[PDB]
Design a protein around this nucleic acid. Structure first.
Ligand SMILES: [Mg+2]
Ligand SMILES: [Mg+2]
Ligand SMILES: [Mg+2]
Ligand SMILES: [Mg+2]
Ligand SMILES: [Mg+2]
Ligand SMILES: [Mg+2]
Ligand SMILES: [Mg+2]
Ligand SMILES: [Mg+2]
Ligand SMILES: [Mg+2]
Ligand SMILES: [Mg+2]
Ligand SMILES: [Mg+2]
Ligand SMILES: [Mg+2]
Ligand SMILES: [Mg+2]
Ligand SMILES: [Mg+2]
Ligand SMILES: [Mg+2]
Ligand SMILES: [Mg+2]
Ligand SMILES: [Mg+2]
Ligand SMILES: [Mg+2]
Ligand SMILES: [Mg+2]
Ligand SMILES: [Mg+2]
Ligand SMILES: [Mg+2]
Ligand SMILES: [Mg+2]
Ligand SMILES: [Mg+2]
Ligand SMILES: [Mg+2]
Ligand SMILES: [Mg+2]
Ligand SMILES: [Mg+2]
Ligand SMILES: [Mg+2]
Ligand SMILES: [Mg+2]
Ligand SMILES: [Zn+2]
Lengths: 71, 64
RNA sequence: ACCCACUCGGCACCUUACGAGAAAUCAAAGUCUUUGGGUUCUGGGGGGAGUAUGGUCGCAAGGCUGAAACUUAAAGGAAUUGACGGAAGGGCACCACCAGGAGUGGAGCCUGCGGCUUAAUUUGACUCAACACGGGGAAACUCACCAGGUCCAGACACAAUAAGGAUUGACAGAUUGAGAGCUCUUUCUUGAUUUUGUGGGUGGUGGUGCAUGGCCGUUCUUAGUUGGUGGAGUGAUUUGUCUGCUUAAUUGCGAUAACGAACGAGACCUUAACCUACUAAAUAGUGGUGCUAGCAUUUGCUGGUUAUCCACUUCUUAGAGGGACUAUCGGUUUCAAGCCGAUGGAAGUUUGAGGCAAUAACAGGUCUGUGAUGCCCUUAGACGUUCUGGGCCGCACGCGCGCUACACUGACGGAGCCAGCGAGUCUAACCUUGGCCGAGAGGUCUUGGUAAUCUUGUGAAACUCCGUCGUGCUGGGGAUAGAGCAUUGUAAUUAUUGCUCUUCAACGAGGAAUUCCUAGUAAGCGCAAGUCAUCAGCUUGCGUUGAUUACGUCCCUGCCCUUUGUACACACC
């Protein structure tokens, strides 16, 4: 054959970030709990799933991709 | 033609540690018992063997 | 001198085999385990070696005598069967010549093989037995090559990570060829399905056909293999199987220590041919009439009518059979097997053509047909696979198959108008008539057909006819090239194909050379089929037109078979 040349440049993939998850919420004066991060407005998602906040961008992730409801 | 008629034939790749050998097996089913086919090689020729006779015996004649 | 009987002593030829022997053979190589007439000499595995040494001889070169160390399993003899021959003698054949046909070889051009060129120009294959071969006509697929981009489809088991989250996925952005979350920005989403390591699996058109199966090509257009009882030989083994004759033929006849069989050739099987005899049919068709056209009219002719009824099976179709057995006759030959001509027959070259095809062989090709396969290799920065694009087509030349021509037995323009084997659309876009529109290509509205029912009668081509050309590269020729129009197709630039106008090459019958073939064949001609979305200068079968020359031989050539030699038997690589 010829085995191996390469301009170098070897790549990875990703990590599934890491991060300890969902404090995001806020239960205050006993034991009243509100919700910080609003939740998706499509049936497929059982209002247990919420909208990340970029700039402009608020989108649904239970939607693997689909649909942006912004605010 | 006889071929098509009187010989079963197989092959089998018997596969093994070392390699495979073909098995190849040929049978002649007796054209005697051919049931519905041609009941012997086309090759055959049987005569029928006559009959000894005590012939002559000048005319005479029977009547019923 | 001869002739002859017989006789001693010579050189020998022969027939035999009482007898010998390992056998070839030997009348001595006989009278030898049933071992003894007399006598001389030599040898005791193969090397080392007739070497060294000593003695001797001879001018000399050399002679005579003549060891050992070490080494080593054979070396050796006769004969058997193979293999092999740059030994001889017979054959066979259009893959070989003869007599001739039609060519390629000369040109343009279509393919393939080389070489060169490229990032890549993927690869197998090299005499017949590699080079239109891999069913190999590659735009993406294919795809093997090259530039790049994704994805696990990493069984399974054990280990660790881990419900505080092992893992998945992504909208927009950047990024990229890409509306690939490949990555990165951002931060939700998922929830024991993976993921990280090992052990072990897994794919692979990676290597190995020189590890294999299977298949396949060649040897072979050949005629060969073999066992019974009997003859020979201690056995290997032979004889049968063979001078000749004949045959496509170990076909026979015949010869004969053999007889009498078998596998293979044959027989057989398929397909072309022959039926006024058989059984049949609106998916075949012929006759008669009805229904009706047009001509002539005395009657006649020539058409329309997928069922208005009658009848039949010469055409067609295919089930069942009949027919040829070189019959007849005359020739000629071991009057044998055969062969020759003639009558006759549908047919008398194995009737024509194929299908099938014994033993044994080749390091023949085929791990690129396979989820046939051993071993090697690789296995996530993949030789797995997939998506993007180029490449297999690259252009100084070499080679092989072809296509088209070189024109007047013609090219063109009308016109006559004649086949066969094939093939076609259900979970769908096949073959397609007819009706339009378009010069062409095609476009379009319909329709029949799962097909002996419809395209189709495949009104094909060669060709037959009345002209237009006028021998001049000319109205032969159609290379190359520009311009447009269409058509398959997600996609046509490197131009898939098609059509139109213009352009108008070489080539004037081809050196040395080499193929193919004996009758419905050669060669001319087109069509169907494969491949197929699109693309035949390809091939497989089809029919149409349809010839001059053999019905010989062995000169070449290839290959058999017999004798022979042999020190090869992994068999002349
Ligand atoms: Mg003897
Ligand atoms: Mg020495
Ligand atoms: Mg010999
Ligand atoms: Mg002859
Ligand atoms: Mg000649
Ligand atoms: Mg010639
Ligand atoms: Mg090779
Ligand atoms: Mg590609
Ligand atoms: Mg693993
Ligand atoms: Mg494979
Ligand atoms: Mg081989
Ligand atoms: Mg093989
Ligand atoms: Mg021939
Ligand atoms: Mg004996
Ligand atoms: Mg013999
Ligand atoms: Mg008939
Ligand atoms: Mg006659
Ligand atoms: Mg080889
Ligand atoms: Mg194979
Ligand atoms: Mg491993
Ligand atoms: Mg190629
Ligand atoms: Mg060829
Ligand atoms: Mg004409
Ligand atoms: Mg127009
Ligand atoms: Mg001209
Ligand atoms: Mg022309
Ligand atoms: Mg075709
Ligand atoms: Mg081809
Ligand atoms: Zn949602």
């Amino acid at each position: 054959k010829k085995v191996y040349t390469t301009p170098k440049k070897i790549k990875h993939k990703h990590k599934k970030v890491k991060l300890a998850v969902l404090s995001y919420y806020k239960v205050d004066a006993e034991g009243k709990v509100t919700k910080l991060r609003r939740e998706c407005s499509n049936p497929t998602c059982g209002a247990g799933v919420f909208l990340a906040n970029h700039k402009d961008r608020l989108y649904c992730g239970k939607c693997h991709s689909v649909y942006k409801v912004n605010a | 033609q006889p071929v098509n008629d009187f010989i079963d034939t197989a092959t089998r790749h018997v596969l093994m540690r070392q390699g495979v050998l073909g098995i190849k097996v040929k049978i002649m089913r007796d054209p005697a018992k051919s049931r519905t086919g041609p009941k012997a090689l086309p090759d055959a020729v049987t005569i029928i063997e006559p009959k000894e006779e005590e012939p002559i015996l000048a005319p005479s004649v029977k009547d019923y």
